[PDB]
CSV table of C-alpha atoms and ligand atoms in Angstrom, one decimal:
chain,number,residue,atom,x,y,z
A,1,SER,CA,0.2,-0.1,0.1
A,2,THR,CA,1.1,3.9,-0.3
A,3,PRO,CA,0.9,6.5,2.0
A,4,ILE,CA,-2.4,8.3,-0.3
A,5,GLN,CA,-4.4,4.4,-0.4
A,6,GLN,CA,-4.2,4.3,3.7
A,7,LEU,CA,-5.0,8.0,4.2
A,8,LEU,CA,-8.0,7.4,1.8
A,9,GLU,CA,-9.1,4.0,3.1
A,10,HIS,CA,-9.4,5.9,6.6
A,11,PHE,CA,-11.4,8.1,5.0
A,12,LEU,CA,-13.8,5.6,3.7
A,13,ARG,CA,-13.9,3.3,7.0
A,14,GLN,CA,-14.9,6.6,8.9
A,15,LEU,CA,-17.8,7.1,6.2
A,16,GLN,CA,-18.7,3.7,6.3
A,17,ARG,CA,-18.9,3.5,10.1
A,18,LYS,CA,-22.0,6.1,9.2
A,19,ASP,CA,-23.8,3.6,7.2
A,20,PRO,CA,-24.2,1.0,9.4
A,21,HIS,CA,-27.2,-1.1,7.3
A,22,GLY,CA,-24.9,-0.8,4.2
A,23,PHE,CA,-27.1,1.3,2.1
A,24,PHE,CA,-24.5,2.6,0.4
A,25,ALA,CA,-22.2,-0.8,0.4
A,26,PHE,CA,-22.8,-1.7,-3.5
A,27,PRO,CA,-24.2,0.1,-7.0
A,28,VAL,CA,-27.9,0.6,-7.0
A,29,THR,CA,-29.6,-2.2,-9.2
A,30,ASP,CA,-32.9,-1.5,-11.2
A,31,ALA,CA,-34.5,-4.4,-9.5
A,32,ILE,CA,-34.0,-2.9,-5.9
A,33,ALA,CA,-34.8,0.8,-7.1
A,34,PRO,CA,-37.5,1.0,-10.3
A,35,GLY,CA,-36.7,3.4,-12.9
A,36,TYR,CA,-33.1,4.1,-11.1
A,37,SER,CA,-30.6,3.6,-14.2
A,38,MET,CA,-33.5,5.9,-16.4
A,39,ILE,CA,-32.7,8.8,-13.6
A,40,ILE,CA,-28.9,8.4,-12.6
A,41,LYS,CA,-26.4,8.5,-15.3
A,42,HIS,CA,-23.5,8.9,-13.3
A,43,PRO,CA,-23.7,6.0,-10.0
A,44,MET,CA,-21.3,5.8,-7.1
A,45,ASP,CA,-21.2,3.6,-4.2
A,46,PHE,CA,-18.8,3.0,-1.2
A,47,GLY,CA,-17.9,-0.4,-2.9
A,48,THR,CA,-16.5,1.3,-6.0
A,49,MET,CA,-14.9,4.2,-4.2
A,50,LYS,CA,-13.1,1.2,-2.1
A,51,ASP,CA,-11.8,-0.5,-5.7
A,52,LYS,CA,-10.7,2.7,-6.5
A,53,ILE,CA,-8.2,3.3,-3.7
A,54,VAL,CA,-7.0,-0.7,-4.3
A,55,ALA,CA,-6.5,0.2,-7.9
A,56,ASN,CA,-4.7,3.6,-7.0
A,57,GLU,CA,-7.5,5.3,-9.5
A,58,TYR,CA,-7.7,8.2,-7.2
A,59,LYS,CA,-4.7,11.2,-7.4
A,60,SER,CA,-5.9,13.2,-4.9
A,61,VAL,CA,-8.3,13.7,-1.9
A,62,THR,CA,-10.5,16.1,-3.7
A,63,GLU,CA,-11.2,13.4,-6.4
A,64,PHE,CA,-12.4,11.1,-3.6
A,65,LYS,CA,-14.6,14.0,-2.0
A,66,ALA,CA,-16.2,14.4,-5.6
A,67,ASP,CA,-17.1,10.7,-5.7
A,68,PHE,CA,-18.3,10.9,-2.1
A,69,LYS,CA,-20.3,14.1,-3.0
A,70,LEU,CA,-21.5,12.1,-6.2
A,71,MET,CA,-22.7,9.3,-4.1
A,72,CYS,CA,-24.9,11.4,-1.8
A,73,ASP,CA,-26.4,13.7,-4.6
A,74,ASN,CA,-27.3,10.4,-6.6
A,75,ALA,CA,-29.3,9.4,-3.4
A,76,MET,CA,-31.3,13.0,-2.7
A,77,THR,CA,-31.9,13.2,-6.8
A,78,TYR,CA,-33.5,9.5,-7.0
A,79,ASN,CA,-35.2,9.3,-3.5
A,80,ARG,CA,-38.3,11.8,-2.0
A,81,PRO,CA,-36.7,14.0,1.1
A,82,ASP,CA,-38.9,12.3,3.9
A,83,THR,CA,-37.2,8.8,2.4
A,84,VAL,CA,-34.5,6.6,4.9
A,85,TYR,CA,-32.1,6.9,1.7
A,86,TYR,CA,-32.3,10.7,1.4
A,87,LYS,CA,-32.1,11.5,4.9
A,88,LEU,CA,-29.0,9.3,5.4
A,89,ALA,CA,-27.5,10.8,2.0
A,90,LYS,CA,-27.2,14.3,3.4
A,91,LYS,CA,-26.3,13.6,7.1
A,92,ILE,CA,-23.1,11.8,5.6
A,93,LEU,CA,-22.5,14.5,2.9
A,94,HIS,CA,-22.3,17.1,6.1
A,95,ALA,CA,-20.2,14.3,8.4
A,96,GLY,CA,-17.7,13.6,5.2
A,97,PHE,CA,-17.4,16.9,4.7
A,98,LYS,CA,-16.3,17.9,7.7
A,99,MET,CA,-14.2,15.3,8.3
A,100,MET,CA,-12.1,15.8,4.8
A,101,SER,CA,-12.7,19.7,5.2
A,102,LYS,CA,-10.2,22.4,3.7
A,103,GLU,CA,-8.9,23.2,7.6
A,104,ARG,CA,-8.5,19.2,8.4
A,105,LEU,CA,-7.1,19.0,5.0
A,106,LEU,CA,-4.2,22.0,5.6
A,107,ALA,CA,-3.8,20.6,9.3
A,108,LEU,CA,-2.3,17.3,7.7
A,109,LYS,CA,-0.6,18.6,5.0
A,110,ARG,CA,1.5,21.0,7.7
A,111,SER,CA,2.0,17.5,9.9
A,112,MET,CA,3.6,15.9,6.5
A,113,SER,CA,6.5,19.1,6.7
B,1,5TU,C1,-32.9,4.0,-4.1
B,1,5TU,C2,-32.1,3.2,-2.8
B,1,5TU,C3,-31.8,2.0,-3.0
B,1,5TU,C4,-30.7,1.2,-2.1
B,1,5TU,C5,-31.0,-0.3,-1.4
B,1,5TU,C6,-29.7,-0.9,-1.1
B,1,5TU,C7,-29.5,-2.1,-0.6
B,1,5TU,C8,-30.5,-2.5,-0.4
B,1,5TU,C9,-30.8,-3.8,0.2
B,1,5TU,N1,-31.3,-4.4,1.4
B,1,5TU,O1,-30.4,-4.9,-0.4
B,1,5TU,C10,-32.0,-1.9,-0.7
B,1,5TU,C11,-31.7,-0.3,-0.7
B,1,5TU,C12,-29.6,2.5,-1.5
B,1,5TU,N2,-29.5,3.7,-2.1
B,1,5TU,C13,-28.4,4.5,-1.8
B,1,5TU,C14,-30.9,3.9,-2.8
B,1,5TU,O2,-30.9,5.2,-3.1
């Protein structure tokens, strides 16, 4: 493993802890959610993110954050606001962007000196 892969795996593990039922663990299929592919053109999930860390597909934390935001935005686009999926996506997006905030990333960058 590389230092970037270890940092991204840490962020991913802490994010997955916020989803204990594993609603974001695997891609959303049309069988579980009718007409999903008709609405969501750029799907994302924690598993695909985990595969991208392992394959070393992320060049920066910004790219990782963009995939995390895409996953949450997709759930908020497809699901109505009073649903379990929309509420969880909104909660985790907020929590994730605090964890990987510019403030927290600057403190980590300063500790790499
Ligand atoms: C619409 C939607 C459905 C799901 C979902 C994932 C797994 C399962 C299951 N129990 O197998 C059921 C529902 C997840 N997400 C993120 C969504 O937007």
